Amino acid sequence: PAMGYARRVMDGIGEVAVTGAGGSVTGARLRHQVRLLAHALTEAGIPPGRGVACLHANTWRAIALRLAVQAIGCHYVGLRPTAAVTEQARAIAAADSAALVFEPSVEARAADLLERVSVPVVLSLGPTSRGRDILAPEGTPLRYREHPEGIAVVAFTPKGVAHSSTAMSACVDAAVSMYGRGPWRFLIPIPLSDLGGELAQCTLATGGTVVLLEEFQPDAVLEAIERERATHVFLAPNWLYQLAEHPALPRSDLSSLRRVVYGGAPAVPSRVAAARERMGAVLMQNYGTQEAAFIAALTPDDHARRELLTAVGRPLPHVEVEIRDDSGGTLPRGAVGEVWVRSPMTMSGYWRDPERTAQVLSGGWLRTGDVGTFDEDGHLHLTDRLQDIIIVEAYNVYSRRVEHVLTEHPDVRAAAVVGVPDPDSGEAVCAAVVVADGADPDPEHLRALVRDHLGDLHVPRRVEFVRSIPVTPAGAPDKVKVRTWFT
Ligand SMILES: Nc1ncnc2c1ncn2[C@@H]1O[C@H](COP(=O)(O)O)[C@@H](O)[C@H]1O
Ligand SMILES: CC(=O)c1nc(C(=O)O)cc2c1[nH]c1ccccc12
Protein backbone atom coordinates (compact mmCIF):
# COMPACT_ATOMS: atom_id res chain seq x y z
CA PRO A 1 0.00 0.00 0.00
CA ALA A 2 1.36 3.40 -1.23
CA MET A 3 0.57 5.18 2.05
CA GLY A 4 3.15 2.90 3.80
CA TYR A 5 5.99 5.36 3.03
CA ALA A 6 4.45 8.49 4.57
CA ARG A 7 3.51 6.40 7.64
CA ARG A 8 7.10 5.02 7.82
CA VAL A 9 8.45 8.58 8.06
CA MET A 10 5.67 9.70 10.44
CA ASP A 11 6.24 6.68 12.69
CA GLY A 12 9.97 7.56 13.00
CA ILE A 13 9.71 11.17 14.19
CA GLY A 14 11.63 11.54 17.48
CA GLU A 15 11.67 14.05 20.37
CA VAL A 16 13.18 16.91 18.32
CA ALA A 17 12.47 16.90 14.58
CA VAL A 18 13.99 20.18 13.29
CA THR A 19 16.44 22.93 14.33
CA GLY A 20 17.11 26.13 12.40
CA ALA A 21 17.33 29.90 12.62
CA GLY A 22 14.54 30.42 15.18
CA GLY A 23 15.43 27.50 17.53
CA SER A 24 13.86 24.00 17.65
CA VAL A 25 10.67 22.16 16.67
CA THR A 26 9.56 19.09 18.64
CA GLY A 27 8.28 15.93 16.94
CA ALA A 28 4.96 16.70 18.60
CA ARG A 29 4.83 20.09 16.91
CA LEU A 30 5.90 18.72 13.49
CA ARG A 31 3.40 15.81 13.65
CA HIS A 32 0.66 18.34 14.48
CA GLN A 33 1.61 20.49 11.49
CA VAL A 34 1.40 17.46 9.16
CA ARG A 35 -2.09 16.56 10.46
CA LEU A 36 -3.14 20.21 10.08
CA LEU A 37 -1.72 20.72 6.57
CA ALA A 38 -3.14 17.31 5.59
CA HIS A 39 -6.69 18.12 6.77
CA ALA A 40 -6.51 21.55 5.09
CA LEU A 41 -5.33 20.15 1.69
CA THR A 42 -8.09 17.51 1.87
CA GLU A 43 -10.73 20.19 2.66
CA ALA A 44 -9.52 22.35 -0.26
CA GLY A 45 -10.75 19.52 -2.56
CA ILE A 46 -7.40 18.18 -3.88
CA PRO A 47 -7.99 14.56 -5.08
CA PRO A 48 -5.44 11.69 -4.67
CA GLY A 49 -4.20 11.04 -8.23
CA ARG A 50 -3.16 14.68 -8.84
CA GLY A 51 0.00 16.66 -7.98
CA VAL A 52 0.58 19.42 -5.39
CA ALA A 53 3.21 21.86 -6.72
CA CYS A 54 5.10 23.44 -3.80
CA LEU A 55 7.09 26.69 -3.87
CA HIS A 56 9.03 27.34 -0.63
CA ALA A 57 12.42 28.03 0.94
CA ASN A 58 14.26 25.74 3.42
CA THR A 59 11.75 26.11 6.31
CA TRP A 60 10.51 23.53 8.83
CA ARG A 61 6.93 23.93 7.63
CA ALA A 62 8.08 22.89 4.11
CA ILE A 63 9.17 19.51 5.57
CA ALA A 64 5.63 19.04 6.96
CA LEU A 65 4.04 20.18 3.67
CA ARG A 66 5.82 17.44 1.65
CA LEU A 67 4.90 14.78 4.17
CA ALA A 68 1.26 15.92 4.21
CA VAL A 69 1.00 16.02 0.40
CA GLN A 70 2.30 12.44 0.34
CA ALA A 71 0.10 11.23 3.28
CA ILE A 72 -3.07 12.45 1.45
CA GLY A 73 -2.03 10.20 -1.46
CA CYS A 74 -0.90 13.03 -3.80
CA HIS A 75 2.44 13.40 -5.56
CA TYR A 76 4.78 16.18 -4.34
CA VAL A 77 6.15 18.53 -6.97
CA GLY A 78 9.01 20.65 -5.57
CA LEU A 79 9.50 23.81 -7.60
CA ARG A 80 13.25 24.46 -7.66
CA PRO A 81 14.27 27.93 -6.31
CA THR A 82 17.01 28.34 -8.98
CA ALA A 83 14.68 27.40 -11.88
CA ALA A 84 13.35 30.04 -14.28
CA VAL A 85 9.68 31.08 -14.02
CA THR A 86 9.06 29.51 -17.50
CA GLU A 87 10.64 26.08 -16.53
CA GLN A 88 8.75 26.06 -13.16
CA ALA A 89 5.47 26.93 -14.91
CA ARG A 90 5.88 24.05 -17.44
CA ALA A 91 6.39 21.74 -14.40
CA ILE A 92 3.18 22.82 -12.62
CA ALA A 93 1.16 22.10 -15.79
CA ALA A 94 2.87 18.86 -16.87
CA ALA A 95 2.68 17.26 -13.39
CA ASP A 96 -1.17 17.54 -13.46
CA SER A 97 -1.06 19.86 -10.42
CA ALA A 98 -4.35 20.30 -8.58
CA ALA A 99 -2.79 22.95 -6.30
CA LEU A 100 -0.01 25.47 -5.85
CA VAL A 101 1.09 25.85 -2.22
CA PHE A 102 3.60 28.62 -1.58
CA GLU A 103 5.33 30.50 1.23
CA PRO A 104 4.64 34.26 1.70
CA SER A 105 8.36 34.98 1.20
CA VAL A 106 8.07 33.90 -2.52
CA GLU A 107 4.64 35.52 -3.36
CA ALA A 108 6.47 37.45 -6.14
CA ARG A 109 7.35 34.23 -7.98
CA ALA A 110 3.91 32.75 -7.15
CA ALA A 111 2.18 35.73 -8.82
CA ASP A 112 4.55 35.50 -11.79
CA LEU A 113 3.74 31.74 -12.13
CA LEU A 114 -0.08 32.25 -11.90
CA GLU A 115 -0.01 34.79 -14.80
CA ARG A 116 1.49 31.87 -16.89
CA VAL A 117 -0.55 28.77 -15.80
CA SER A 118 -3.96 28.16 -14.14
CA VAL A 119 -4.36 25.92 -11.08
CA PRO A 120 -7.71 24.83 -9.51
CA VAL A 121 -6.65 25.63 -5.92
CA VAL A 122 -4.09 28.17 -4.59
CA LEU A 123 -2.96 28.01 -0.96
CA SER A 124 -0.17 29.59 1.09
CA LEU A 125 1.66 28.82 4.35
CA GLY A 126 0.66 32.05 6.08
CA PRO A 127 -1.34 35.22 5.17
CA THR A 128 -0.86 36.24 1.52
CA SER A 129 -2.42 38.43 -1.19
CA ARG A 130 -2.46 35.93 -4.15
CA GLY A 131 -3.62 32.80 -2.15
CA ARG A 132 -5.75 31.25 0.67
CA ASP A 133 -3.85 30.83 3.98
CA ILE A 134 -3.83 27.15 5.11
CA LEU A 135 -2.62 27.90 8.69
CA ALA A 136 -6.20 28.80 9.76
CA PRO A 137 -8.65 21.27 13.66
CA GLU A 138 -9.94 19.31 16.74
CA GLY A 139 -8.06 16.28 18.12
CA THR A 140 -8.04 15.37 14.38
CA PRO A 141 -5.73 12.44 13.37
CA LEU A 142 -3.80 12.11 10.09
CA ARG A 143 -6.23 10.76 7.47
CA TYR A 144 -4.22 8.96 4.72
CA ARG A 145 -5.36 8.36 1.12
CA GLU A 146 -3.68 6.16 -1.54
CA HIS A 147 -2.23 7.57 -4.77
CA PRO A 148 -3.95 5.53 -7.55
CA GLU A 149 -0.55 4.76 -9.16
CA GLY A 150 1.65 4.80 -6.03
CA ILE A 151 3.60 7.96 -6.93
CA ALA A 152 5.17 9.98 -4.05
CA VAL A 153 7.21 12.57 -6.05
CA VAL A 154 7.46 14.01 -9.55
CA ALA A 155 10.64 15.94 -10.22
CA PHE A 156 11.80 17.66 -13.41
CA THR A 157 14.97 17.85 -15.55
CA PRO A 158 12.30 18.59 -19.71
CA LYS A 159 10.84 15.35 -18.26
CA GLY A 160 9.00 14.67 -14.98
CA VAL A 161 10.56 11.81 -13.06
CA ALA A 162 7.89 9.77 -11.23
CA HIS A 163 9.15 8.05 -8.07
CA SER A 164 7.03 5.43 -6.33
CA SER A 165 6.37 5.35 -2.55
CA THR A 166 8.16 1.98 -2.62
CA ALA A 167 11.26 3.56 -4.19
CA MET A 168 11.31 6.38 -1.61
CA SER A 169 11.11 3.78 1.18
CA ALA A 170 14.05 1.91 -0.40
CA CYS A 171 15.99 5.22 -0.29
CA VAL A 172 15.60 5.26 3.50
CA ASP A 173 17.22 1.82 3.62
CA ALA A 174 19.98 3.03 1.29
CA ALA A 175 20.49 6.12 3.46
CA VAL A 176 20.93 3.94 6.56
CA SER A 177 23.38 1.70 4.75
CA MET A 178 25.50 4.75 3.65
CA TYR A 179 25.14 7.13 6.63
CA GLY A 180 24.89 4.82 9.68
CA ARG A 181 22.08 3.97 12.06
CA GLY A 182 20.17 6.83 13.52
CA PRO A 183 19.57 9.09 15.11
CA TRP A 184 21.38 11.64 12.89
CA ARG A 185 21.71 15.38 13.46
CA PHE A 186 21.67 16.04 9.68
CA LEU A 187 22.52 19.54 8.37
CA ILE A 188 20.70 20.29 5.11
CA PRO A 189 21.85 23.45 3.25
CA ILE A 190 20.63 22.22 -0.17
CA PRO A 191 17.05 22.97 -1.35
CA LEU A 192 14.24 20.93 0.27
CA SER A 193 12.48 20.95 -3.13
CA ASP A 194 14.80 18.09 -4.35
CA LEU A 195 17.30 15.71 -2.71
CA GLY A 196 17.43 17.86 0.46
CA GLY A 197 13.75 17.08 0.99
CA GLU A 198 14.29 13.32 0.70
CA LEU A 199 17.28 13.53 3.06
CA ALA A 200 15.05 15.31 5.58
CA GLN A 201 12.49 12.45 5.41
CA CYS A 202 15.29 9.82 5.73
CA THR A 203 16.48 11.79 8.80
CA LEU A 204 13.04 11.98 10.44
CA ALA A 205 12.30 8.33 9.56
CA THR A 206 15.44 7.17 11.44
CA GLY A 207 14.42 9.25 14.52
CA GLY A 208 16.96 12.05 14.10
CA THR A 209 16.91 15.81 13.81
CA VAL A 210 17.03 17.89 10.61
CA VAL A 211 19.17 21.05 10.89
CA LEU A 212 18.16 23.61 8.24
CA LEU A 213 20.09 26.41 6.54
CA GLU A 214 18.48 28.61 3.86
CA GLU A 215 21.59 28.73 1.60
CA PHE A 216 25.26 27.68 1.96
CA GLN A 217 27.92 30.03 3.43
CA PRO A 218 31.11 28.27 4.69
CA ASP A 219 31.17 30.11 8.09
CA ALA A 220 27.45 29.38 8.61
CA VAL A 221 27.91 25.63 8.04
CA LEU A 222 31.01 25.65 10.26
CA GLU A 223 29.17 27.42 13.16
CA ALA A 224 26.11 25.17 12.66
CA ILE A 225 28.14 21.97 12.89
CA GLU A 226 29.73 23.14 16.17
CA ARG A 227 26.62 24.84 17.71
CA GLU A 228 24.21 21.93 16.87
CA ARG A 229 26.89 19.19 17.12
CA ALA A 230 25.70 17.96 13.68
CA THR A 231 26.60 14.43 12.65
CA HIS A 232 25.82 14.67 8.96
CA VAL A 233 25.88 17.27 6.20
CA PHE A 234 25.28 17.11 2.44
CA LEU A 235 27.22 19.50 0.23
CA ALA A 236 27.56 20.15 -3.47
CA PRO A 237 31.21 19.35 -4.43
CA ASN A 238 32.08 23.06 -4.83
CA TRP A 239 30.86 23.68 -1.28
CA LEU A 240 32.99 20.86 0.05
CA TYR A 241 36.04 22.60 -1.35
CA GLN A 242 35.07 26.03 0.07
CA LEU A 243 34.51 24.50 3.48
CA ALA A 244 37.73 22.46 3.48
CA GLU A 245 39.79 25.45 2.30
CA HIS A 246 38.23 27.85 4.83
CA PRO A 247 40.78 29.39 7.28
CA ALA A 248 38.61 28.84 10.39
CA LEU A 249 38.29 25.06 9.73
CA PRO A 250 41.18 23.90 11.99
CA ARG A 251 40.11 26.48 14.66
CA SER A 252 36.53 24.95 14.57
CA ASP A 253 35.28 21.85 16.44
CA LEU A 254 33.74 19.28 14.09
CA SER A 255 34.21 16.21 16.36
CA SER A 256 30.42 15.58 16.14
CA LEU A 257 30.70 14.87 12.36
CA ARG A 258 30.31 11.22 11.38
CA ARG A 259 29.68 12.09 7.66
CA VAL A 260 30.38 14.92 5.25
CA VAL A 261 28.50 13.82 2.17
CA TYR A 262 29.00 15.38 -1.23
CA GLY A 263 27.87 14.53 -4.75
CA GLY A 264 25.52 15.48 -7.54
CA ALA A 265 28.22 16.58 -9.94
CA PRO A 266 31.74 15.33 -10.84
CA ALA A 267 34.43 16.03 -8.23
CA VAL A 268 37.96 17.42 -8.67
CA PRO A 269 40.20 14.63 -7.28
CA SER A 270 43.03 16.91 -6.05
CA ARG A 271 40.52 19.16 -4.29
CA VAL A 272 38.79 16.15 -2.78
CA ALA A 273 42.16 14.73 -1.66
CA ALA A 274 42.75 18.05 0.07
CA ALA A 275 39.39 17.90 1.84
CA ARG A 276 40.07 14.31 2.99
CA GLU A 277 43.30 15.60 4.64
CA ARG A 278 41.87 18.85 6.10
CA MET A 279 38.59 17.17 7.33
CA GLY A 280 38.87 13.76 8.94
CA ALA A 281 37.79 10.30 7.97
CA VAL A 282 34.24 11.63 7.55
CA LEU A 283 34.19 12.24 3.78
CA MET A 284 31.61 10.32 1.77
CA GLN A 285 30.72 10.77 -1.90
CA ASN A 286 27.28 9.91 -3.31
CA TYR A 287 26.40 9.20 -6.96
CA GLY A 288 22.82 9.28 -8.20
CA THR A 289 20.62 10.52 -11.04
CA GLN A 290 17.09 11.91 -11.01
CA GLU A 291 15.90 8.65 -12.57
CA ALA A 292 18.07 6.21 -10.58
CA ALA A 293 18.05 7.87 -7.14
CA PHE A 294 21.04 6.55 -5.10
CA ILE A 295 23.51 4.32 -7.05
CA ALA A 296 26.92 4.32 -5.28
CA ALA A 297 28.98 5.78 -2.44
CA LEU A 298 32.68 6.31 -1.76
CA THR A 299 33.43 5.83 1.96
CA PRO A 300 35.93 7.76 4.13
CA ASP A 301 38.26 4.74 4.00
CA ASP A 302 37.94 4.68 0.15
CA HIS A 303 39.04 8.37 0.17
CA ALA A 304 42.40 7.41 1.72
CA ARG A 305 43.45 5.64 -1.50
CA ARG A 306 44.41 8.24 -4.20
CA GLU A 307 43.57 5.60 -6.91
CA LEU A 308 39.89 5.92 -5.84
CA LEU A 309 39.59 9.69 -6.00
CA THR A 310 38.41 9.29 -9.61
CA ALA A 311 35.66 6.85 -8.52
CA VAL A 312 32.05 7.13 -7.26
CA GLY A 313 32.45 4.05 -5.12
CA ARG A 314 30.96 0.59 -4.75
CA PRO A 315 27.27 0.27 -5.72
CA LEU A 316 24.85 0.34 -2.77
CA PRO A 317 23.01 -2.80 -1.50
CA HIS A 318 20.33 -3.95 -4.02
CA VAL A 319 21.84 -1.74 -6.73
CA GLU A 320 22.88 -3.81 -9.75
CA VAL A 321 25.19 -2.04 -12.25
CA GLU A 322 26.21 -3.18 -15.74
CA ILE A 323 28.56 -1.70 -18.35
CA ARG A 324 27.25 -2.06 -21.93
CA ASP A 325 28.19 -1.43 -25.61
CA ASP A 326 26.16 0.53 -28.26
CA SER A 327 24.55 -2.89 -29.14
CA GLY A 328 23.46 -3.49 -25.51
CA GLY A 329 25.64 -6.46 -24.48
CA THR A 330 27.47 -6.83 -21.16
CA LEU A 331 31.23 -5.92 -21.15
CA PRO A 332 33.92 -7.33 -18.79
CA ARG A 333 35.60 -5.62 -15.78
CA GLY A 334 37.90 -2.76 -16.86
CA ALA A 335 36.01 -2.01 -20.11
CA VAL A 336 34.44 1.43 -20.65
CA GLY A 337 30.73 1.59 -21.60
CA GLU A 338 27.28 2.91 -20.66
CA VAL A 339 26.29 2.56 -17.01
CA TRP A 340 22.95 0.70 -16.64
CA VAL A 341 21.23 0.29 -13.28
CA ARG A 342 18.55 -2.04 -11.81
CA SER A 343 17.37 -1.21 -8.24
CA PRO A 344 14.34 -0.73 -5.94
CA MET A 345 15.05 3.03 -5.96
CA THR A 346 14.74 3.54 -9.74
CA MET A 347 11.99 5.72 -11.20
CA SER A 348 8.65 4.25 -12.26
CA GLY A 349 8.94 6.25 -15.48
CA TYR A 350 8.64 9.70 -16.96
CA TRP A 351 5.21 11.06 -15.94
CA ARG A 352 2.60 10.74 -18.74
CA ASP A 353 5.28 10.22 -21.46
CA PRO A 354 5.94 6.48 -22.08
CA GLU A 355 7.57 7.35 -25.46
CA ARG A 356 10.62 8.85 -23.61
CA THR A 357 10.39 6.37 -20.69
CA ALA A 358 10.88 3.50 -23.17
CA GLN A 359 14.19 4.85 -24.59
CA VAL A 360 15.63 4.89 -21.04
CA LEU A 361 14.19 1.75 -19.36
CA SER A 362 14.65 -1.74 -20.79
CA GLY A 363 13.86 -4.95 -18.93
CA GLY A 364 13.86 -3.23 -15.52
CA TRP A 365 17.26 -1.64 -16.29
CA LEU A 366 17.77 2.12 -16.39
CA ARG A 367 20.27 3.78 -18.75
CA THR A 368 21.81 6.42 -16.41
CA GLY A 369 23.37 8.40 -19.30
CA ASP A 370 26.81 8.01 -17.81
CA VAL A 371 29.79 6.13 -19.12
CA GLY A 372 32.34 4.38 -16.95
CA THR A 373 34.07 1.25 -15.82
CA PHE A 374 34.90 -0.91 -12.81
CA ASP A 375 38.33 -1.44 -11.25
CA GLU A 376 39.92 -4.64 -9.78
CA ASP A 377 38.13 -3.97 -6.44
CA GLY A 378 34.66 -3.21 -7.95
CA HIS A 379 34.56 0.58 -7.56
CA LEU A 380 32.76 2.33 -10.41
CA HIS A 381 34.66 5.11 -12.22
CA LEU A 382 32.69 7.54 -14.42
CA THR A 383 34.71 8.70 -17.42
CA ASP A 384 31.94 10.95 -18.77
CA ARG A 385 28.32 11.94 -19.29
CA LEU A 386 27.34 10.52 -22.73
CA GLN A 387 26.65 14.02 -24.28
CA ASP A 388 30.17 15.12 -23.18
CA ILE A 389 32.26 12.40 -24.91
CA ILE A 390 34.60 13.81 -27.56
CA ILE A 391 34.89 11.54 -30.60
CA VAL A 392 37.92 11.77 -32.85
CA GLU A 393 37.96 9.33 -35.79
CA ALA A 394 36.57 6.27 -33.92
CA TYR A 395 38.33 6.96 -30.58
CA ASN A 396 36.59 8.24 -27.45
CA VAL A 397 38.27 11.08 -25.60
CA TYR A 398 36.56 11.23 -22.20
CA SER A 399 36.43 14.89 -21.19
CA ARG A 400 36.48 14.07 -17.43
CA ARG A 401 39.82 12.23 -17.85
CA VAL A 402 41.34 15.37 -19.48
CA GLU A 403 39.90 17.55 -16.69
CA HIS A 404 41.42 15.25 -14.00
CA VAL A 405 44.88 15.67 -15.54
CA LEU A 406 44.56 19.44 -16.00
CA THR A 407 43.24 19.86 -12.46
CA GLU A 408 46.13 17.84 -10.91
CA HIS A 409 48.39 20.83 -11.76
CA PRO A 410 48.97 22.85 -8.56
CA ASP A 411 48.03 26.13 -10.30
CA VAL A 412 44.69 24.81 -11.73
CA ARG A 413 41.54 24.74 -9.52
CA ALA A 414 38.93 23.66 -12.20
CA ALA A 415 38.54 22.64 -15.83
CA ALA A 416 35.81 22.03 -18.39
CA VAL A 417 36.81 20.16 -21.57
CA VAL A 418 34.55 20.09 -24.65
CA GLY A 419 34.71 19.10 -28.30
CA VAL A 420 34.00 21.34 -31.28
CA PRO A 421 33.78 19.79 -34.76
CA ASP A 422 36.84 19.88 -37.02
CA PRO A 423 37.20 18.27 -40.50
CA ASP A 424 40.96 17.53 -39.95
CA SER A 425 40.80 16.26 -36.30
CA GLY A 426 37.11 15.02 -36.15
CA GLU A 427 36.51 17.16 -33.03
CA ALA A 428 39.04 19.59 -31.59
CA VAL A 429 39.56 19.38 -27.81
CA CYS A 430 39.15 22.65 -25.87
CA ALA A 431 39.65 23.54 -22.23
CA ALA A 432 38.27 26.31 -20.11
CA VAL A 433 40.55 26.37 -17.07
CA VAL A 434 40.18 28.12 -13.73
CA VAL A 435 43.53 29.20 -12.31
CA ALA A 436 44.47 29.38 -8.61
CA ASP A 437 44.47 32.40 -6.22
CA GLY A 438 46.84 34.63 -8.24
CA ALA A 439 48.86 32.15 -10.31
CA ASP A 440 49.75 32.39 -14.00
CA PRO A 441 50.52 28.90 -15.40
CA ASP A 442 51.67 28.21 -18.90
CA PRO A 443 49.05 26.86 -21.36
CA GLU A 444 51.88 24.83 -22.85
CA HIS A 445 52.71 23.20 -19.47
CA LEU A 446 49.10 22.02 -19.20
CA ARG A 447 49.14 20.82 -22.80
CA ALA A 448 52.33 18.95 -21.96
CA LEU A 449 50.89 17.46 -18.77
CA VAL A 450 47.94 16.04 -20.69
CA ARG A 451 50.24 14.70 -23.44
CA ASP A 452 52.51 12.89 -20.90
CA HIS A 453 49.56 11.24 -19.06
CA LEU A 454 46.92 10.55 -21.74
CA GLY A 455 48.52 10.98 -25.19
CA ASP A 456 48.34 13.14 -28.28
CA LEU A 457 44.61 12.79 -29.00
CA HIS A 458 43.64 14.16 -25.54
CA VAL A 459 45.70 17.39 -25.70
CA PRO A 460 43.52 20.53 -25.85
CA ARG A 461 44.21 22.66 -28.93
CA ARG A 462 42.76 25.79 -27.22
CA VAL A 463 43.09 26.72 -23.52
CA GLU A 464 41.10 29.71 -22.18
CA PHE A 465 41.64 30.95 -18.64
CA VAL A 466 38.30 31.97 -17.10
CA ARG A 467 37.29 33.36 -13.67
CA SER A 468 34.90 30.38 -13.08
CA ILE A 469 33.16 27.48 -14.86
CA PRO A 470 29.44 28.32 -15.32
CA VAL A 471 26.94 26.05 -13.59
CA THR A 472 23.38 25.02 -14.47
CA PRO A 473 20.43 25.94 -12.21
CA ALA A 474 21.00 22.47 -10.64
CA GLY A 475 24.70 23.41 -10.04
CA ALA A 476 26.31 21.11 -12.64
CA PRO A 477 29.07 22.26 -15.08
CA ASP A 478 27.25 23.95 -17.97
CA LYS A 479 29.31 22.32 -20.69
CA VAL A 480 26.91 23.63 -23.37
CA LYS A 481 27.67 27.25 -22.37
CA VAL A 482 31.37 26.30 -22.51
CA ARG A 483 30.99 24.60 -25.92
CA THR A 484 29.71 27.97 -27.29
CA TRP A 485 32.84 29.92 -26.16
CA PHE A 486 34.94 27.83 -28.59
CA THR A 487 32.67 27.92 -31.70
N1 LIG B 1 29.37 11.72 -7.30
C1 LIG B 1 29.27 12.01 -8.61
N2 LIG B 1 30.30 11.98 -9.49
C2 LIG B 1 30.15 12.27 -10.83
N3 LIG B 1 29.01 12.63 -11.43
C3 LIG B 1 27.91 12.69 -10.61
C4 LIG B 1 27.95 12.40 -9.14
N4 LIG B 1 26.73 12.54 -8.61
C5 LIG B 1 25.95 12.91 -9.67
N5 LIG B 1 26.65 13.01 -10.82
C6 LIG B 1 26.20 13.37 -12.18
O1 LIG B 1 24.87 13.95 -12.19
C7 LIG B 1 24.29 13.35 -13.36
C8 LIG B 1 22.79 13.43 -13.37
O2 LIG B 1 22.35 14.61 -12.68
P1 LIG B 1 20.80 15.03 -12.94
O3 LIG B 1 20.79 15.53 -14.39
O4 LIG B 1 20.43 16.12 -11.91
O5 LIG B 1 20.07 13.70 -12.76
C9 LIG B 1 24.74 11.91 -13.31
O6 LIG B 1 24.46 11.29 -14.54
C10 LIG B 1 26.21 12.08 -13.03
O7 LIG B 1 26.94 12.27 -14.24
C1 LIG C 1 23.16 10.46 -4.53
C2 LIG C 1 23.08 11.80 -5.18
O1 LIG C 1 23.96 12.61 -4.98
C3 LIG C 1 21.91 12.13 -6.06
N1 LIG C 1 22.15 12.84 -7.18
C4 LIG C 1 21.13 13.16 -8.01
C5 LIG C 1 21.41 14.03 -9.23
O2 LIG C 1 20.41 14.38 -9.85
O3 LIG C 1 22.59 14.38 -9.49
C6 LIG C 1 19.82 12.77 -7.75
C7 LIG C 1 19.54 12.03 -6.61
C8 LIG C 1 20.60 11.70 -5.75
N2 LIG C 1 20.11 10.96 -4.70
C9 LIG C 1 18.75 10.78 -4.87
C10 LIG C 1 17.84 10.09 -4.06
C11 LIG C 1 16.53 10.08 -4.46
C12 LIG C 1 16.11 10.71 -5.64
C13 LIG C 1 17.00 11.40 -6.44
C14 LIG C 1 18.35 11.45 -6.05
Author numbering: -1 to 134, 138 to 158, 165 to 494
Question: Can you quote the paper on this entry?
Answer:
A further enzyme, McbA, has recently been reported in the biosynthetic pathway towards the marinacarbolines in Marinactinospora thermotolerans by Ji and co‐workers. McbA catalyzes the ATP‐dependent coupling of the β‐carboline derivative 6 with 2‐phenylethylamine a to form 6 a via adenylate 7, but, unlike other ABSs, McbA also accepted other amines, including substituted 2‐phenylethylamines and tryptamines, thus indicating some promise for the application of this enzyme to reactions with a wider substrate spectrum. McbA adopts a structure within the ANL superfamily of adenylating enzymes defined by Gulick, and which includes firefly luciferase, acetyl‐CoA synthase, and standalone adenylation domains of NRPSs, including the dihydroxybenzoate adenylating enzyme enzyme DhbE20 from the bacillibactin biosynthetic pathway. Each ANL enzyme is characterized by a two‐domain structure in which a large N‐terminal domain is coupled to a smaller C‐terminal one, consisting of 4–500 and 100 amino acid residues, respectively.
To investigate the promiscuity in term of aryl acid recognition by McbA, the structure of the enzyme was determined using X‐ray crystallography. A K483A mutant co‐crystallised with AMP, magnesium ions, and the β‐carboline acid substrate 6 yielded crystals of diffraction quality. The structure was solved using molecular replacement, and refined to a resolution of 2.80 Å (data collection and refinement statistics can be found in Table S2 in the Supporting Information). The McbA structure features the two predicted domains: the large N‐terminal domain of residues 1–394 (McbAN) and the smaller C‐terminal one comprising residues 395–494 (McbAC), with the hinge residue at Q394. Crucially, the structures of many ANL enzymes have revealed substantial relative domain rotation during the reaction coordinate, with one conformation (“adenylation”) assumed for adenylate formation from the carboxylate substrate and ATP, and a second, (“thiolation”) in which the C‐terminal domain rotates to enable the ligation reaction between the phosphopantetheinate thiol and the adenylate intermediate. The substrate 6 is bound within a hydrophobic pocket stacked between the loop between G295 and F301 on one face and L202 on the other. Few specific interactions between active‐site residues and the substrate are made, except that the carbonyl oxygen and pyridine nitrogen of 6 interact with the backbone N‐H and C=O of G295 at distances of approximately 3.9 and 3.4 Å respectively. The relative lack of specific interactions may help to explain the relaxed specificity of McbA for the range of aryl acids used in this study. The exception was quinoline derivative 18, in which the N‐atom in the 1‐position has had an adverse effect on conversion, perhaps disrupting the hydrophobic interaction made by the native ligand with F301.
